[PDB]
Nucleic acid binder design. Structure first.
Ligand SMILES: Nc1ncnc2c1ncn2[C@H]1C[C@H](O)[C@@H](COP(=O)(O)OP(=O)(O)OP(=O)(O)O)O1
Ligand SMILES: [Mg+2]
Ligand code: NA
Ligand code: NA
Length: 314
DNA sequence: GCCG
DNA sequence: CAGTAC
DNA sequence: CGGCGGTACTG
């Protein structure tokens, strides 16, 4: 973890991202990672241009930060960028909505509150704006997962509940809590969302819903808001997925991430004429589902050594 | 932005 | 669907 | 030249 050039590239990357240039931002992201994972601090355009994820343009940027101490592009970042970042940090608003609000003359969250048309999701995002930008201590994510597990296992004690995401990857803090739920009998997972969510509502634990198709008996996810009881508590984002046991390993792998790790893994599967998703590991263009009873089986079928969750924190 |  | 989200 | 993971809600 030994480069200073990435600090400058990070600003450009974020600038491109909030302005909607998502593929250019991805290229910066991959390069920033390539720079982060190099041994010696790069000192040559040739040395830089050799690195995978770094091309002529990125090398030149590097060759300027080394031989000048600065990146000229950083002085010509659009003035809109910090406001675009402010707006897209509202949950449920992305770059398109942020750019529309900016075009309409809005410059602050007060402008948004008083003058913007907000979706139901965005109104919830705005009212929890600071809280959703916080990370919680690992210990708090444990309490939240346990709250969900207790409510679930009260209804069916055979239900398996696992906190995934950054929590399973062992991080000291968590942006939210990601809970996977399944049942080993392969059937009793069906239709339980209404039951589980109603239970968590009865005791006031859930405070708002963001994404929750409860009219669908095949509902796959709940994205919402919770808050533990007592003083000193903030509102926290809570994501729940309910999956068939036959998809456990792929769902676990997906939900544990990281996101970058998932993208890398799926890209690798595609090179081998396979396809990897939260549902299954399959073959080429419908395709054949491969047997993956455990995460280790997914690595194996892809010709990879098993990585522990903590080693997937890419 | 990068890569094939 | 486009947007936003995981 | 043109894709870059693959998928699930919302309105
Ligand atoms: N774009 C994505 N593509 C594929 N998988 C994703 C994507 N985004 C999120 N996931 C998967 C992997 C993530 O680890 C998991 C949970 O998402 P998320 O809660 O945003 O991240 P996280 O739990 O890893 O970190 P954080 O602490 O910020 O919440 O869902
Ligand atoms: Mg998370
Ligand atoms: Na947002
Ligand atoms: Na709903």
């Amino acid at each position: 973890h030994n480069l200073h050039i990435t600090e400058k590239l990070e600003v450009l990357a974020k600038a491109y991202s909030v302005q909607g240039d998502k593929w250019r931002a991805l290229g910066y992201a991959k390069a920033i990672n390539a720079l982060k994972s190099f041994h010696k601090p790069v000192t040559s355009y040739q040395e830089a241009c050799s690195i995978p994820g770094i091309g002529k343009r990125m090398a030149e940027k590097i060759i300027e930060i080394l031989e000048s101490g600065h990146l000229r592009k950083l002085d010509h970042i659009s003035e809109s960028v910090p406001v675009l970042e402010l707006f897209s940090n509202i949950w449920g608003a992305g770059t398109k909505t942020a750019q529309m609000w900016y075009q309409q003359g809005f410059r602050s969250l007060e402008d948004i509150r008083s003058q913007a048309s907000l979706t139901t999701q965005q109104a919830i995002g705005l009212k929890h704006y600071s809280d959703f930008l916080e990370r919680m201590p690992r210990e708090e994510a444990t309490e939240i997962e346990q709250t969900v597990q207790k409510a679930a296992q009260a209804f069916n004690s055979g239900l398996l509940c696992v906190a995934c995401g950054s929590y399973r990857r062992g991080k000291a803090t968590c942006g939210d809590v990601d809970v996977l739920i399944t049942h080993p009998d392969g059937r009793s997972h069906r239709g339980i969302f209404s039951r589980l969510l109603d239970s968590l509502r009865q005791e006031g634990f859930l405070t708002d819903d963001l994404v929750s198709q409860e009219e669908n008996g095949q509902q796959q996810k709940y994205l919402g808001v919770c808050r533990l009881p007592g003083p000193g508590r903030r509102h926290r984002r809570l994501d729940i997925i309910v999956v068939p046991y036959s998809e456990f390993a792929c769902a676990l792998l997906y939900f544990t991430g990281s996101a970058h790790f998932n993208r890398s893994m799926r890209a690798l599967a595609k090179t081998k004429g396979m396809s990897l998703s939260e549902h299954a590991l399959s073959t080429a263009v419908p395709g054949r589902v491969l047997p993956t009873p455990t995460e280790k089986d997914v690595f194996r079928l892809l010709g990879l050594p098993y990585r522990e969750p903590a080693e997937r924190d890419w």
